[PDB]
Amino acid sequence: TPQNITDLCAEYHNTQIHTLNDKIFSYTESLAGKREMAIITFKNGATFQVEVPGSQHIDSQKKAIERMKDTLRIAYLTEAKVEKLCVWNNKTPRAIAAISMAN
Amino acid sequence: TPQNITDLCAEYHNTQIHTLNDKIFSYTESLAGKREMAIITFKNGATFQVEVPGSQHIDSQKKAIERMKDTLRIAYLTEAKVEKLCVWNNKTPRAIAAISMAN
Amino acid sequence: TPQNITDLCAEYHNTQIHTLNDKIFSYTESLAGKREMAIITFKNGATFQVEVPGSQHIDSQKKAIERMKDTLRIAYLTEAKVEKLCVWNNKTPRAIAAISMAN
Amino acid sequence: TPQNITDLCAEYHNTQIHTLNDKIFSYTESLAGKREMAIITFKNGATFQVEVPGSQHIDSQKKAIERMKDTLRIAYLTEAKVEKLCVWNNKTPRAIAAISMAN
Amino acid sequence: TPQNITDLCAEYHNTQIHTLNDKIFSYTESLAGKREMAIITFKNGATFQVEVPGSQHIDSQKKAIERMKDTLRIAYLTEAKVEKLCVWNNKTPRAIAAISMAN
Numbered sequence: 001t002p003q004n005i006t007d008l009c010a011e012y013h014n015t016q017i018h019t020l021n022d023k024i025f026s027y028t029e030s031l032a033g034k035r036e037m038a039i040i041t042f043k044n045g046a047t048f049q050v051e052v053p054g055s056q057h058i059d060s061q062k063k064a065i066e067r068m069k070d071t072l073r074i075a076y077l078t079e080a081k082v083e084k085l086c087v088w089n090n091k092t093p094r095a096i097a098a099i100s101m102a103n
Numbered sequence: 104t105p106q107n108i109t110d111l112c113a114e115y116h117n118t119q120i121h122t123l124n125d126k127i128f129s130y131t132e133s134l135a136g137k138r139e140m141a142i143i144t145f146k147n148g149a150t151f152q153v154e155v156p157g158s159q160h161i162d163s164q165k166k167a168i169e170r171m172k173d174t175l176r177i178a179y180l181t182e183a184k185v186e187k188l189c190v191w192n193n194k195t196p197r198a199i200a201a202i203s204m205a206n
Numbered sequence: 207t208p209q210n211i212t213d214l215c216a217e218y219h220n221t222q223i224h225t226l227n228d229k230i231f232s233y234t235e236s237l238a239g240k241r242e243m244a245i246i247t248f249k250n251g252a253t254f255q256v257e258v259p260g261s262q263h264i265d266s267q268k269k270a271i272e273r274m275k276d277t278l279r280i281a282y283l284t285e286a287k288v289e290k291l292c293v294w295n296n297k298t299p300r301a302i303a304a305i306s307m308a309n
Numbered sequence: 310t311p312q313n314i315t316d317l318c319a320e321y322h323n324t325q326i327h328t329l330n331d332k333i334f335s336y337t338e339s340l341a342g343k344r345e346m347a348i349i350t351f352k353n354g355a356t357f358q359v360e361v362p363g364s365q366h367i368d369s370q371k372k373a374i375e376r377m378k379d380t381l382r383i384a385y386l387t388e389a390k391v392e393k394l395c396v397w398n399n400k401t402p403r404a405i406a407a408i409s410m411a412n
Numbered sequence: 413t414p415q416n417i418t419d420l421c422a423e424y425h426n427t428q429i430h431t432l433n434d435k436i437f438s439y440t441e442s443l444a445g446k447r448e449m450a451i452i453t454f455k456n457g458a459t460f461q462v463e464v465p466g467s468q469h470i471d472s473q474k475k476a477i478e479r480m481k482d483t484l485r486i487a488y489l490t491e492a493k494v495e496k497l498c499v500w501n502n503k504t505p506r507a508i509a510a511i512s513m514a515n
């Protein structure tokens with residue numbers, strides 16, 4: 001079991017860490033069929049999604065996907081600094097696997 | 104997968120984007136049977152709903168409808184600026200498909 | 207579909223609109239068996255309930271009853287102005303069907 | 310149906326009202342097995358629990374127990390004044406049945 | 413039934429109390445499959461997890477694990493002082509069993 005987001009990210013293929021150390025610039029969410037997702041951006045233009053739940057996800061991830069969208073929304077609204085994102089780089093927009101917040 | 108609300112909106116028939124760049128003026132929600140819905144307005148009078156769930160919705164959208172009502176309520180209470188709404192034109196009030204929020 | 211709380215209220219028998227234009231004065235909730243309910247009051251003493259779920263509710267209302275209690279608690283805690291309540295007047299305390307919030 | 314917490318409390322055996330008119334001093338919660346519970350204290354030392362869900366509860370209470378723990382956490386974090394608690398006094402710590410909050 | 417986190421923690425093997433009396437320094441959350449977890453740190457470098465749900469957990473603990481991640485997120489965002497953690501010491505990072513907040 002990892003102790004931080006960088007080591008967690010390294011337990012997966014097709015992932016990378018992005019260091020933001022910034023608040024979220026915009027928060028988008030959709031209830032439209034087959035596009036039940038969230039998208040965040042940063043002022044540097046960087047865009048990330050929480051993927052639509054699908055075949056790629058194991059059952060244990062379903063609650064965690066919902067939690068992540070909850071986390072992004074409240075981080076956005078409270079202007080919380082996002083430290084790092086672990087993302088999958090075989091999706092466009094890059095898909096969030098993990099988030100760290102500090103400072 | 105789309106990277107922003109405008110492109111997402113364009114993936115659906117008979118939708119449009121409204122640009123508000125304003126906080127929500129009023130928030131209404133109902134538990135009354137067959138009217139389990141939310142209604143928001145802006146100061147210009149513009150009125151939008153989250154639809155009552157029905158057969159027009161696929162299963163994957165049901166959780167997202169609930170999340171959207173959560174989002175609208177907290178956006179209202181925090182006076183968060185709503186950037187755009189993607190809506191369906193064939194409902195009255197216009198039915199929300201997606202929301203974006205930015206400073 | 208209605209566009210505001212007043213029109214929604216009028217789609218039901220046994221209802222009335224209360225215009226409060228005030229924050230909630232007190233919030234009460236109970237987990238006691240057969241009394242799993244919330245009660246709110248306003249400054250003038252006027253009292254309203256979210257009813258115990260029961261056979262007078264259809265299945266689609268169960269989630270909306272839980273949402274309404276969520277709404278009333280956060281409205282109370284944030285001192286959000288309640289504009290109107292739509293209530294059923296064939297219950298004591300008057301039973302909330304819908305709420306609108308506006309400053 | 311009762312109009313207030315005092316009248317509600319009187320509908321049950323083994324209960325009493327505590328009039329606190331104070332914020333919560335401490336909030337404790339546990340996920341440990343068979344001790345999935347919350348405990349609050351007040352500055353006067355008074356201590357209360359939300360009981361572990363069990364055989365003493367009917368199914369309609371399960372969602373209300375979870376809601377109560379949510380309420381106590383947010384009341385704690387926002388320093389909301391608790392007016393009264395209705396508690397079962399045949400338990401140690403005294404077990405919360407209902408809460409009222411007023412400025 | 414215990415009356416405080418210290419006595420609760422002593423009902424379990426392989427647990428200990430850490431006294432922090434500090435806000436959470438960082439909050440990390442993951443939706444990655446098999447690492448659906450949260451990690452917190454304190455400025456003294458201490459690191460704790462909420463374990464991935466699994467067979468070491470009885471069914472009643474699953475809702476309480478979700479609640480705990482909710483609690484840690486909002487405690488982080490509000491800079492709430494954590495008084496004590498009860499943690500299992502047979503896990504790395506040490507795994508949270510209970511939390512207390514005061515002052």
Ligand SMILES: CC(=O)N[C@H]1[C@H](O[C@@H]2[C@H](O[C@]3(C(=O)O)C[C@H](O)[C@@H](NC(C)=O)[C@H]([C@H](O)[C@H](O)CO)O3)[C@@H](O)[C@H](O[C@H]3[C@H](O)[C@@H](O)[C@H](O)O[C@@H]3CO)O[C@@H]2CO)O[C@H](CO)[C@H](O)[C@@H]1O[C@@H]1O[C@H](CO)[C@H](O)[C@H](O)[C@H]1O
Pocket residue numbers: 011012013014051055056057058061088090091095444445446447
């Ligand atoms: C890389 C990949 O295809 N991942 C998909 C995963 O495949 C499993 C194994 O991949 C890892 C991984 O995702 O990196 C390997 C990591 O070590 C694992 N880490 C931990 C901490 O457990 C993760 C983790 O278990 C899963 O992610 C949890 O769901 O899995 C992959 O190496 C393995 O490959 C097999 C191959 O399939 C087989 O034919 C060949 O003979 O042997 C290879 C091993 O040498 O296959 C594993 C599945 O059996 O599978 C999951 C579903 O279980 C997803 O499909 C995952 O795809 C990504 O999913 C992401 C969201 O969760 C996101 O959408 C990404 O864009 C997807 O690529």
Ligand SMILES: CC(=O)N[C@H]1[C@H](O[C@@H]2[C@H](O[C@]3(C(=O)O)C[C@H](O)[C@@H](NC(C)=O)[C@H]([C@H](O)[C@H](O)CO)O3)[C@@H](O)[C@H](O[C@H]3[C@H](O)[C@@H](O)[C@H](O)O[C@@H]3CO)O[C@@H]2CO)O[C@H](CO)[C@H](O)[C@@H]1O[C@@H]1O[C@H](CO)[C@H](O)[C@H](O)[C@H]1O
Pocket residue numbers: 135136137138217218219220257261262263264267294296297301
């Ligand atoms: C009035 C009443 O007893 N309502 C109960 C309802 O009864 C149904 C019809 O009532 C309405 C209503 O609630 O006003 C009629 C509205 O037009 C409907 N509006 C919409 C937008 O759909 C609603 C709505 O469909 C339901 O509320 C959704 O569950 O229903 C009622 O008129 C009808 O009885 C007529 C009868 O047909 C007629 O021959 C005779 O002359 O008079 C009767 C009384 O007007 O019966 C319908 C049911 O078959 O039924 C629901 C559940 O099925 C509830 O029991 C409802 O009671 C209210 O419930 C509220 C909570 O949802 C709240 O607790 C109130 O205090 C209850 O009275």
Ligand SMILES: CC(=O)N[C@H]1[C@H](O[C@@H]2[C@H](O[C@]3(C(=O)O)C[C@H](O)[C@@H](NC(C)=O)[C@H]([C@H](O)[C@H](O)CO)O3)[C@@H](O)[C@H](O[C@H]3[C@H](O)[C@@H](O)[C@H](O)O[C@@H]3CO)O[C@@H]2CO)O[C@H](CO)[C@H](O)[C@@H]1O[C@@H]1O[C@H](CO)[C@H](O)[C@H](O)[C@H]1O
Pocket residue numbers: 238239240241320321322323360364365366367370397399400404
């Ligand atoms: C007193 C007691 O042991 N209560 C347990 C309950 O027993 C039922 C009757 O209790 C009441 C009550 O809890 O006060 C009586 C009230 O009038 C009811 N009020 C309303 C508004 O309905 C409540 C309510 O129905 C239940 O609480 C909902 O679940 O129930 C109890 O009096 C009765 O036993 C009588 C017996 O009938 C009589 O012949 C003899 O002379 O005296 C007995 C004791 O007074 O038994 C009823 C059930 O058959 O049952 C529930 C079931 O889930 C609980 O076990 C309840 O225990 C309390 O539970 C609380 C949490 O819900 C909390 O943990 C308290 O500490 C428990 O004591």
